[PDB]
Design an enzyme around this catalytic site. Structure first.
Site, PDB file in Angstrom:
ATOM      1  N   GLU A  13      -8.461  10.134   3.377  1.00 41.01           N
ATOM      2  CA  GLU A  13      -8.526   9.041   4.336  1.00 41.01           C
ATOM      3  C   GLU A  13      -8.696   9.592   5.732  1.00 41.01           C
ATOM      4  OE1 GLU A  13      -5.355   6.156   4.407  1.00 41.01           O
ATOM      5  OE2 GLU A  13      -6.114   5.253   6.256  1.00 41.01           O
ATOM      6  N   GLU A  56       0.849  -1.179   0.000  1.00 42.48           N
ATOM      7  CA  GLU A  56       0.000   0.000   0.000  1.00 42.48           C
ATOM      8  C   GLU A  56       0.887   1.232   0.000  1.00 42.48           C
ATOM      9  OE1 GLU A  56      -2.283   0.832   3.647  1.00 42.48           O
ATOM     10  OE2 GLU A  56      -4.070   0.926   2.393  1.00 42.48           O
TER      11      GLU A  56
END
Length: 185
Positions: A172, A78
């Site tokens: 996020e 990620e």
């Protein structure tokens, strides 16, 4: 460029009002959430892509990131290119720095244990980060020349997987509240 991917994931905590706007525009209103990731981008990421964006609204009331976000498989990684944040600046194991698009970014690596991954379920995976040393002003046309980050990461032994998943300019958040409005191209 026309975005072709819409990212809207939440672990179910709190309120996350994500709006899929016209073109590459999207907005998010969140309140007392768990973890969530919302954004627009491309179904298949590329190490040569140049991402453009304009955050007309960036108002986090706690922990939240304005960041390029993506995944690769083989291996599962990620990655992030953080331009702005809320009350918490993400950090990890310092590797070095990279200058790109008018800013200086710190390079970090971290690991997530038994956490949700792109494939669903839980697993352990590595995270690559490029975090601006100071918050990038928002409301203007910004560019992220991803190749600079990919190359800098490589120089530190941070190699991405061979299978590219989605790549998006996202918002996020983690146990926080706030608002954002971003346009990607």
């Amino acid at each position: 460029a026309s975005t072709d991917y819409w990212q809207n994931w939440t672990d179910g905590g709190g309120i996350v009002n994500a709006v899929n706007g016209s073109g590459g525009n999207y907005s998010v209103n969140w309140s007392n959430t768990g973890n969530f990731v919302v954004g627009k981008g491309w179904t298949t990421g590329s190490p040569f892509r140049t991402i453009n964006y304009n955050a007309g609204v960036w108002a986090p009331n706690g922990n939240g990131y304005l960041t390029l976000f993506g995944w690769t498989r083989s291996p599962l990684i990620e990655y992030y290119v953080v331009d702005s944040w809320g009350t918490y600046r993400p950090t990890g194991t310092y590797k070095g720095t990279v200058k790109s698009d008018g800013g200086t970014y710190d390079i970090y690596t971290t690991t997530r244990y038994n956490a949700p991954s792109i494939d669903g379920d839980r697993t352990t995976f590595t995270q690559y980060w490029s975090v601006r040393q100071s918050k990038r002003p928002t409301g203007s046309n910004a560019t992220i020349t991803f190749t600079n980050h990919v190359n800098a990461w490589k120089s530190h032994g941070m190699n991405l997987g061979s299978n590219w998943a989605y790549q998006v300019m996202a918002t996020e958040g983690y146990q926080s509240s706030g608002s954002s409005n971003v346009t990607v191209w």
